[PDB]
Enzyme design. Structure first.
Site, mmCIF file in Angstrom:
data_model
loop_
_atom_site.group_PDB
_atom_site.id
_atom_site.type_symbol
_atom_site.label_atom_id
_atom_site.label_comp_id
_atom_site.label_asym_id
_atom_site.label_seq_id
_atom_site.Cartn_x
_atom_site.Cartn_y
_atom_site.Cartn_z
ATOM 1 N N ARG A 26 41.973 21.402 68.502
ATOM 2 C CA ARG A 26 42.075 20.187 69.285
ATOM 3 C C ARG A 26 41.082 20.185 70.436
ATOM 4 O O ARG A 26 40.446 21.201 70.733
ATOM 5 C CB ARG A 26 43.501 19.991 69.801
ATOM 6 C CG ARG A 26 44.448 19.426 68.769
ATOM 7 C CD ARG A 26 45.549 18.645 69.416
ATOM 8 N NE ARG A 26 45.016 17.426 70.018
ATOM 9 C CZ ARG A 26 45.705 16.567 70.763
ATOM 10 N NH1 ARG A 26 47.001 16.743 71.010
ATOM 11 N NH2 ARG A 26 45.085 15.505 71.249
ATOM 12 N N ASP A 51 51.393 22.167 72.334
ATOM 13 C CA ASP A 51 50.611 22.195 73.566
ATOM 14 C C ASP A 51 50.837 23.509 74.324
ATOM 15 O O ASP A 51 50.920 23.537 75.554
ATOM 16 C CB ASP A 51 50.936 20.974 74.440
ATOM 17 C CG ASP A 51 50.572 19.655 73.769
ATOM 18 O OD1 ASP A 51 49.537 19.589 73.078
ATOM 19 O OD2 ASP A 51 51.323 18.674 73.940
ATOM 20 N N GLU A 326 43.881 12.169 82.208
ATOM 21 C CA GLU A 326 42.563 12.593 81.771
ATOM 22 C C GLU A 326 41.576 11.465 81.985
ATOM 23 O O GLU A 326 41.914 10.278 81.780
ATOM 24 C CB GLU A 326 42.585 12.963 80.300
ATOM 25 C CG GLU A 326 43.580 14.048 79.956
ATOM 26 C CD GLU A 326 43.974 14.014 78.501
ATOM 27 O OE1 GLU A 326 43.900 12.911 77.913
ATOM 28 O OE2 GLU A 326 44.361 15.077 77.949
ATOM 29 N N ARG A 342 42.428 7.561 81.473
ATOM 30 C CA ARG A 342 43.553 7.370 80.555
ATOM 31 C C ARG A 342 44.756 6.873 81.332
ATOM 32 O O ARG A 342 45.071 7.387 82.404
ATOM 33 C CB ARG A 342 43.904 8.674 79.816
ATOM 34 C CG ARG A 342 45.217 8.649 79.004
ATOM 35 C CD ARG A 342 45.365 9.919 78.178
ATOM 36 N NE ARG A 342 46.709 10.094 77.646
ATOM 37 C CZ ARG A 342 47.114 11.156 76.948
ATOM 38 N NH1 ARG A 342 46.270 12.140 76.661
ATOM 39 N NH2 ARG A 342 48.371 11.234 76.533
HETATM 40 C C1 LIG Z 1 47.605 20.802 79.268
HETATM 41 C C2 LIG Z 1 48.183 19.904 78.172
HETATM 42 O O1 LIG Z 1 49.371 19.962 77.881
HETATM 43 N N1 LIG Z 1 47.307 19.094 77.568
HETATM 44 C C3 LIG Z 1 47.756 18.170 76.511
HETATM 45 C C4 LIG Z 1 47.891 16.755 77.126
HETATM 46 C C5 LIG Z 1 48.946 16.666 78.237
HETATM 47 O O2 LIG Z 1 50.202 17.186 77.766
HETATM 48 C C6 LIG Z 1 49.167 15.237 78.761
HETATM 49 O O3 LIG Z 1 47.949 14.689 79.300
HETATM 50 C C7 LIG Z 1 50.287 15.256 79.815
HETATM 51 O O4 LIG Z 1 50.657 13.918 80.139
HETATM 52 O O5 LIG Z 1 48.273 15.742 76.152
HETATM 53 C C8 LIG Z 1 47.609 15.776 74.969
HETATM 54 C C9 LIG Z 1 47.673 14.532 74.093
HETATM 55 O O6 LIG Z 1 47.070 14.571 73.001
HETATM 56 O O7 LIG Z 1 48.293 13.540 74.535
HETATM 57 C C10 LIG Z 1 46.888 16.887 74.530
HETATM 58 C C11 LIG Z 1 46.785 18.194 75.319
HETATM 59 N N2 LIG Z 1 47.199 19.206 74.332
HETATM 60 C C12 LIG Z 1 46.503 20.281 73.989
HETATM 61 N N3 LIG Z 1 45.342 20.583 74.575
HETATM 62 N N4 LIG Z 1 47.012 21.079 73.045
#
Ligand SMILES: CC(=O)N[C@H]1[C@H]([C@H](O)[C@H](O)CO)OC(C(=O)O)=C[C@@H]1NC(=N)N
Ligand SMILES: CC(=O)N[C@H]1[C@H]([C@H](O)[C@H](O)CO)OC(C(=O)O)=C[C@@H]1NC(=N)N
Ligand SMILES: [Cl-]
Ligand SMILES: [Cl-]
EC number: 3.2.1.18
Lengths: 468, 469
Positions: A26, A51, A326, A342
């Site tokens: 990812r 995550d 983000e 976002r």
């Molecule tokens: C640090 C972390 O948990 N990063 C997450 C992110 C995040 O949970 C949200 O922005 C929180 O609102 O969401 C998402 C997502 O696809 O919505 C992917 C990231 N996942 C991965 N990198 N596996």
């Protein structure tokens, strides 16, 4: 026009591992370097597609403008807790990276999140635990010992000191040497390995760091081939109120014009202890004016922002719809910095800074002609025939599907006029990263699945102005 | 063994002002100086008897050990907003003081809360506003201008600077010159007074400070006769998460032994943004090792405190019974510092620091033999015939009534053994401040009312070892 997709990071199928024993990838980041090279960065998720868990920070390199790619290079991959009851949550976590190159030193940075063993952002405690301590003008990371209240510190040579300031027989690996720096945080007594300071369950050593969200940085001075040991940049930029502080993944920028030219901008976002992930996610940048040596936090877009009657602050807000998470950052020729964030409004939200990313203007601009379904995006500055544009890529909707490449003309006042909206990928589409290639050509690395692929396979496509 | 009560600060009666035009007095602080002078500090409440409004920081001095007292000396009294629609909430606030003298330099400090115009601690906003900005290593107070998002700063000579760092024609009175420094914060455009940066309603100038809780300090180098202009100490001690930061009123101490001897300790307490006054009130001390020039925050008693088998932090807690608020601080002969803290357990809560007030031991001791009805208390170290004791005064209860003076032996291990519990004032009894006077005598300034006296009149009594034992 548009090339067919090339699969750069391949995920397994039907919930199974791929041929490398990896479930999925990812979080693309695409860097076009000074030497023409393309660095493709990703979260490598060995065990499952959550995550958290065992995730390494990895890159691949293409020296022929994205045609063929070399073998995976691991920047950082912390070792698992070999005693954890549930291996799915039994690894210290690195997650979400941002890539950027300094154009003067050519140093390449990867900045990414770190958490001790557990569920990452979804495992954060309701209560603060102090992570650092200042003693005689030096900032030391704190260690906690079970059944003892006081803060131990990690000082010179990684030697652990008591709360009262006396040297112990214990020491931390602060200069890791193993491949992927998998030895970072190892806790020794003499030459006996006892455990790891990032382990939180079934510990075999007495010590652990604060349970918190951290920000780490690694760099490469050889075009992404080898990388330094992780540097903990948290204490330079995390304020005492911040709960989560993490990157907005993709590719950062370096300011090319204005009083702050040479400034490295890295999108980040925070949460607070009032509403955390429910009403506080707030985008900002961190920056370095000394080619990545020291880092500073800009103010949040949400700081002193007027929202439906009343001023909010990132540290105290509780407003779901006023969150911004983000983000992707671009500098205009007039010196303005735009932050594409976002959010939860259904459309594109943009903040503007007049001082190189430190403070933001009072209004968040909404562009109803670009949908945002609550997913990461990327945007880059581009010049075409003496004219200034912005290219932005994200999902078209209604879900994380139908990838679009939007083209905007930037007006003299920094207003954006959306000219074209070009679908680039049917079916599944999520995170993506853009780079300019050198003609009228552009590259995109994005998230997509087909044929039962685990979320996600990371794939690459080139397009040109005729596509745009 | 116990003198009759002498009224030091007299309130008016039946909601009326006294002869000086003052409704009431609150928050006693009693300080025996190097000279033998007794200084009695108080909140002087002109308009009404609430936790906001027009409040002056005032003292009286006795030069004959509490028998006679001189005229009121006003330390600080910020001018009211003359355009405020409601005068009872129309003044910048100072509220709650701690007194302490540095035994070396002889300098006397009064440390007290400050809030801009409004309801003090009961008018705080849900949202933070940044109060200070560091510009090239220099810390300046922020100003907000009507119709603008950006942070202006108050710099050298009071000159107001734009967000982009350009000098304006606007200026703040940073060096006040009027009686009681009532001109502090005045906003000028060149030579014309426009308004005040501490006003929040019906403003006649474009500028105002962050809406926040502040900590101010004034000092005297002449035994309490004259006082410096207020120093804003807030940025030295207030973290980026703290909502309220304010004093636990009464009299602070200077450590008299150990490696941190000379350290000045000032009880304070905080709230956070998670639960504010409902579940986060947390005691700690701020301290100075350079004779009051610079100040530092100690850690909260509640930082890394185990409650219900789980660790809390003052910045994130939400636990009613785990709160600790106003406190009184005492150093033992062994070097350990005891913090007696107002709380919600119904009895006396005490924390111990072994590092000069910086961090606190994991166990908060409770003493069921001293009631705490959730009111301020004062406590002091004393020696009697070669043995070590602590004297603590507070209300005996059930309500804020029945003043008590409690006596504890301090044991070799720092444990307190409560020996005597002596009634000192029947009827209403609230805030109080103890001082040792010398030759086996002790003084106490305390809150009390009788026959329709507005809350409160501040009275003084002297007692001796015989009263104690
Ligand atoms: C640090 C972390 O948990 N990063 C997450 C992110 C995040 O949970 C949200 O922005 C929180 O609102 O969401 C998402 C997502 O696809 O919505 C992917 C990231 N996942 C991965 N990198 N596996
Ligand atoms: C700054 C401030 O508001 N100080 C208050 C104090 C405070 O409200 C509580 O400790 C909050 O829990 O309570 C009391 C009190 O009698 O309980 C008196 C002080 N009142 C006056 N000095 N007027
Ligand atoms: Cl361990
Ligand atoms: Cl005004």
């Amino acid at each position: 026009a548009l090339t067919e997709k090339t699969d750069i990071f391949e995920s397994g199928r039907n919930g199974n591992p791929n041929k490398d024993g990896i479930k999925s990838y990812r979080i693309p980041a695409l860097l076009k370097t000074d030497k023409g090279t393309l660095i493709a960065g990703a979260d490598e998720r060995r065990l499952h597609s959550s995550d958290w868990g065992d995730i390494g920070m990895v890159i691949r390199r293409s020296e022929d403008n994205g045609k063929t790619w070399g073998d995976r290079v691991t920047i950082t991959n912390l070792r698992d807790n070999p005693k954890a009851s549930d291996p799915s949550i039994g690894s210290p976590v690195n997650i979400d990276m941002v890539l950027v190159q300094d154009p003067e030193t050519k140093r390449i940075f990867s900045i990414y999140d770190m958490f001790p063993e557990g569920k990452g952002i979804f495992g954060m405690s309701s209560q603060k635990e102090e992570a650092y301590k200042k003693i005689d003008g030096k900032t030391y990371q704190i260690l906690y010992r079970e059944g003892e209240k006081g803060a131990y510190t990690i000082r010179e040579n990684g030697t652990v000191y008591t709360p009262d300031g006396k040297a112990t027989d214990y020491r931390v690996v602060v200069d890791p040497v193993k491949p992927a720096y998998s030895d970072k945080g190892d806790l020794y007594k003499g030459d006996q390995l006892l455990g790891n300071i990032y382990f939180t369950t079934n510990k075999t050593s007495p010590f652990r760091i604060a349970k918190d969200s951290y920000l780490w940085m690694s760099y490469s001075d050889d075009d992404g081939k080898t990388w330094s040991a992780p540097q903990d940049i948290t204490p330079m930029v995390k304020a005492d109120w911040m709960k989560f502080l993490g990157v907005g993944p993709g590719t950062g920028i370096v300011l090319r014009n204005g009083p702050h030219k040479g400034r490295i901008l890295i999108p980040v976002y925070t949460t607070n202890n009032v509403s955390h992930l429910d009403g506080s996610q707030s985008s900002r940048v961190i920056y370095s004016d000394d080619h990545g040596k020291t880092w500073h936090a800009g103010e949040a877009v949400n700081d002193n922002r007027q929202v439906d009657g009343q001023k909010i602050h990132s540290s105290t807000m509780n407003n779901r719809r006023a969150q911004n998470t983000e983000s992707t950052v671009v500098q205009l020729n007039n010196g303005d910095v735009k932050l594409f964030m976002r959010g939860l409004t259904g459309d594109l939200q943009v903040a503007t800074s007049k001082d190189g990313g430190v403070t933001w203007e009072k209004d968040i601009k909404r562009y109803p002609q670009v949908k945002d379904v609550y997913v990461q995006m990327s945007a880059i500055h581009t010049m075409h025939e003496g004219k200034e544009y912005i290219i932005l890529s994200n999902a078209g909707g209604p879900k994380r599907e139908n990838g679009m490449v939007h083209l905007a003309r930037v007006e003299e006042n920094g207003e954006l006029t959306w000219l074209k909206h070009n679908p680039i990928q049917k079916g599944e589409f999520a995170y993506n990263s853009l780079q300019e290639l050198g003609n009228g050509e552009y590259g995109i690395l994005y998230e997509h699945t087909e044929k039962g692929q685990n979320a996600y396979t990371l794939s690459f496509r080139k397009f040109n102005w005729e596509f745009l």
